[PDB]
Amino acid sequence: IMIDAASSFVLPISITKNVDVLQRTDEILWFRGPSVIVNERIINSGDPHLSLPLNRNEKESLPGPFVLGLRPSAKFTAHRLSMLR
Amino acid sequence: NQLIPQAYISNFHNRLTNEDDGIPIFTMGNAVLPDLQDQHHNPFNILRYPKIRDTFINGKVVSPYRLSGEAIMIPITLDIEHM
């Protein structure tokens, strides 16, 4: 199992006309596999949607993925911006 | 490392034959020397002065030469043509 493969490639034709949105070298970088989209980085480790307790067929349409991601409440953020100045 | 040795430059004869310095021994900011101006502890800054890269470029390496009740003073003149 090797480590030092290249795994990125560049085509010789300068097509740099409509490409300011992609990832440029500074040309266009062309990798050997796709990307990986990760929804939320921090798992919410309790929350019986995920913990599955052993007590007591049901569906639930939760709002967004933001339930599973430890977001702070806004009153603390306003308190901290008041503590800013 | 990065330290200048303490000796081994004797650029004196080229200033004797510089023809800008008014030395009568031979015939054939806005300051000039940084003896009042700091250089913020880089020696490379002293290479901006035009009489000092003269003594690093045109210098050489020298080897050190090694060695009554009333004084009577006598003046001695010296006048020799040579080449």
């Binding site: 290249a6 034709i13 062309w30 | 490392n1 200048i4 020696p43 490379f44 470029i57």
Partner: peptide, 29 residues
Amino acid sequence: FETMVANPIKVSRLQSNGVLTIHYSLANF
């Protein structure tokens, strides 16, 4: 376009780790 072999970018591991960024240490004329 299907005959357009691409150029590998090699990383050369010792370049990736610790490369810094000689006359500017004044001891060598």
